Structures are given as C-alpha cells and as structure tokens.
Design a protein around this ligand. Sequence first.
Ligand SMILES: OC[C@H]1O[C@@](CO)(O[C@H]2O[C@H](CO)[C@@H](O)[C@H](O)[C@H]2O)[C@@H](O)[C@@H]1O
Length: 579
Amino acid sequence: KMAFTLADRVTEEMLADKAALVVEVVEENYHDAPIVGIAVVNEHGRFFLRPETALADPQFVAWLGDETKKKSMFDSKRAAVALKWKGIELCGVSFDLLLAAYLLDPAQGVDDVAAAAKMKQYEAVRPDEAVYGKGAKRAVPDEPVLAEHLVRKAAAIWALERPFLDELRRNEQDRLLVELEQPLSSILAEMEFAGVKVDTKRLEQMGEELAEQLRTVEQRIYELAGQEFNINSPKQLGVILFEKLQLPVLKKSKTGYSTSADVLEKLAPYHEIVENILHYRQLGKLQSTYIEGLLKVVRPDTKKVHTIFNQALTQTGRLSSTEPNLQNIPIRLEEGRKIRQAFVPSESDWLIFAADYSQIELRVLAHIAEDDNLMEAFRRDLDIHTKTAMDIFQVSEDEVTPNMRRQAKAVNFGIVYGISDYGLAQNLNISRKEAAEFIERYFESFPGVKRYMENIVQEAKQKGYVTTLLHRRRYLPDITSRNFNVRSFAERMAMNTPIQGSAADIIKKAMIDLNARLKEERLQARLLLQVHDELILEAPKEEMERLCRLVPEVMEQAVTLRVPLKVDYHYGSTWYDAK
DNA sequence: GACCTCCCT
DNA sequence: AGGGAGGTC
Ligand SMILES: OC[C@H]1O[C@@](CO)(O[C@H]2O[C@H](CO)[C@@H](O)[C@H](O)[C@H]2O)[C@@H](O)[C@@H]1O
C-alpha cells in the first residue's frame, strides 16, 4: 500500500522540474471529458491531487504549461486534449511511456501502464481494467483506491523511463521517439481539438433521400422474393437466396451461406433480386454508418466532429482514427462520395485543401529495392500501372488495353502486400497457375524487387524483425513456423512492413515539417486530418495560392529517396470539392 | 457480452 | 498489407 501524500493544496515541492505526471481521463473518448485525479512523483515524493484543486491553482497551471518543467507520462495526448478543453496548456512532456512501448514492440498491444511495466518485470501497478472494471460495470472507484492507483502508475512511469530509453537507444529508436512520435503527438492533439465542421442539415437531407430509396429497394426485394423477411438477417436471406430461389451456393461461411458482395455479383445473372440486395446494402451502409453514425458523434454545440487518432495501435506505424473514423469516408463510388459534401471549413471564407502523395508505397519500394527499372519509371514520372502492363505483357504503350492495365495494377498491389499465388488469383478471379505466371513475369521485369523480397524474408528470419526507413520495427516470430499458412503470412508481413511503415514514417515527418513551416510563415491554415498518404487542411481563401506551393513542397522534401516524391493537391468549398 | 460484411489507404 | 464499425448466440 504505497506511500504518498493525499494533498489538500499544491506546494512548491510538487513543482520540481522533473516529474512523472498522471492526469487521469477515464472516459474512452477524452474530448471535453472529466479529469478524475492527478498524481505527481518526483525527487521529493509522491503526491495525489484532486483536480478541482490542482487545476484552479495558478502555480500548478503555470507548471503544467512551462516547457522547461519536464514531465514523463503515459498517453500524454489524452491529458493534453482533455486539458485543452478546460483552457489549460500542457507542455514539457519529454517522455511518453505509451509511445516508447509501442515503438519497442507494437505487437504487445500495450494500452495501459501495467502492460508497459510488465515488459520490464515491473508488476507493482494494477491494470486499469482491474481498477475501473469493464463494460457496464465500468466506474471510478472511491478516492483511496483511485489515489493509490494513480500514484502507482506515476511511480511506474518514474521507474521505467530509464530502462525504456536505454532499450530505444540500443534499437536506434531514441530519435524516433523524441523527434518524431512525441512531437507528432502534439500535432495530433491540436488536430483532434480543432475538429472538422459538419453541415448537419446537408447530412440530414441526404439521410431523408436515402430513407426513401431504401423503402423503395426494400419493397422491390420483397416483391421479387415473393415474401417479406429481414434482409439483414443472414439466416433469412440465405434461406431466400439459396433455398427458395435455388441460387448456386458458391461459398459457405462457418455458420451458413456467404452473401458477401463478391458472391452476390457472381449470382446476379440468375435472378433480379440480387442487384437489388446489393443496391440495398450500398444504401444501408451509407445510411447506417455514415449518415447516422456521423450525426450521432457531431457535437451539437459546434457542429464539429473530433476524432481520436490512435497513435500506438497499428503494427506498421500508421495511425488509426476513431469515433468517428475519418479515414474511411466514402470516395470510390459517386453516391457515397457525396457524403464528403458535408465536411466543410469551420469559418466563413475558408476553404478545404487536400494534398496527397502519388504512389508513395511503390516509390518507397523502388528506393529500398533499388530496382533500376522501377526507379527509372518514377524518374520519368510514368503511369506506373501502364508501365508495369507494358513490361509484364511485353507490349508497347499503344497496345495496353484497359483490362491489361487493370490486371497490372492488381499485380502492383499484390507485390506491395506480399505477393501470394492464391491471393492474386482470388483477386483477379483467375487460376493459381495463372497468377504465378503474372508474378514470375513481374519479377523478370523487376529483378531488384525480387531480390528485395527474398532478402527481407531472410533478414526477418536472421534478426527476428524488420525495420523501416526511420527505424520503426516489427518482430515476426511466426516466420520460423513449420505451419505453411502461419509462416507465409509472416513472410508477407516482412515484405510489406518496410514499405507501408516507411511510408508512414515519411508522412509523419512531413506533418512535423509542415506544422513548423505554417508557423514560420504565420499562416492561419490548419491541419485537420491525415488519411495515410494524404493531409487535409482548412485555410482562408486568401492563403490557397501560397498553400499550393508550400504544402506539396514540404511533403515532397520530407525525406530524400533515390526517386522523387510527388504530391498532388486540390482545394474547394467542401472536402468533396477538394479533389 | 462476445463472436464474427463493407468502407478506406 | 494495415485499419473501424448488426444479428445471433
Ligand atoms: O487515448 C488513446 C490511447 O488510449 C488507448 C488505451 O491506452 O486506447 C483507448 O482510447 C481509444 C480512443 O478513445 C479507444 O478507441 C480504445 O479502445 C481505448 O482503449 C490506446 O490504445 C490509444 O493509443
């Protein structure tokens, strides 16, 4: 039962210039959420402070905001954002244990202090789920249980900083933490806090239209089936399709019949019900996920959505986005793409600006494999899919048909994602031997990429892990498995991770550089979103001409590869128009 | 509460 | 390759 002072007021010894700090936000979504307690551990002892007290105290608030007072935390973004909503600035965070753990091994799934501490045989702190409970039983406990927990977390952070930093340094990941991921965390905090404005009237009118179209298609489905049923029930739908209407059963699921879109597409020539079910699903997905889903998370006071970017989740170093997810808003089909009309600038006479890398993953691959043919292709800024068709089919530019380009494109994705005989076959709807011939001809045209693929697999086996341009790592223990499927998946991860991961490194660095350029130029332009290889901003209309030159340049110069990077850009009144 | 089709890069 | 988010048990 760890010693600490349950403090009634803030004292000078709580404001040392080095400390572990816990600002606890228990709600999963930390936007405008309560801070339930504070703990500080420093050279003078261990302290718990009630937030009503600490956050009203001018000395404490100035300490929080002083860059020269260094704090070590876990998930400093959560605290920073929660504090921003209360008008308080958090500065001087020099060590974030969540990001440190994530870099050391993303596969551990570290999401609390206890899981991080377990990596170094430190168990004198409880998992958050043990203290707060799970699901419906989730609750803040009484003060003495709460206080002890926060203090134990702080004490763990204080104890673990040094060994985590030592291991990062041995991995050559110390600059990755200190110069990339930690400064990025501040930039993401500002993006989440600013949020993105939504035209909720426009979404509601879309929702009304969709509701009418759904009622129509739905009636049509019941007419064509000859009865009413729950179209979203796999049991009822599978009975209608595969028993009542006798459609061929092309694929089963562990429980019943598959009605995935790929199966339905193949069944459409047999019965008119099938196109209507597909249409119903496109509409229903829009309605349910995007319209209703966005509307439920829009803040009614500002009409903004404030995503949370999970910076310590993906196995490759990408971000993810949640509540809402703003990295999967429809774009591919026009009907869906119109959802983007509802994402608007947050001030009048401002516009949305979007800049995206062109083929970043293939250009990274060109660089890392040093394939002469691929590098020349990007040096000429060729259409990479047409060029790959020309090579694999041994034809001139004029003889590449649309279908040939389409298939070369699939091969390029396949090569990036780890090249499987069977996997390319499923994808192109072709045979296994056929897919192998495409891959062999690819590797004959790009022998540098073949060498890379062989070499990276051997390197993952030898070292136990693969690395990215900026020294992110991924351990791949399944690469020595004697099970074919398990081993092959590890091999694909070995081939793909340095590509997807290095692309993630580059865009993160560009975000950092951009943020610094925007400040130097004193532009009001603000970063709103990152969607893997693109950045989305809003700015005054009067800044567009300048952003057209600045943004692509910063993004293109973020790193120097053996091939150029290229960035395209667009702007307009809504996110839809920025493209 | 847990398990298990479709949107994005 | 990497993610986030209703029916049935
Ligand atoms: O604060 C984001 C940060 O917290 C973790 C838990 O350590 O994830 C929590 O917050 C996410 C966003 O609200 C939730 O989606 C997630 O379920 C919740 O545990 C980290 O994974 C994340 O980096």
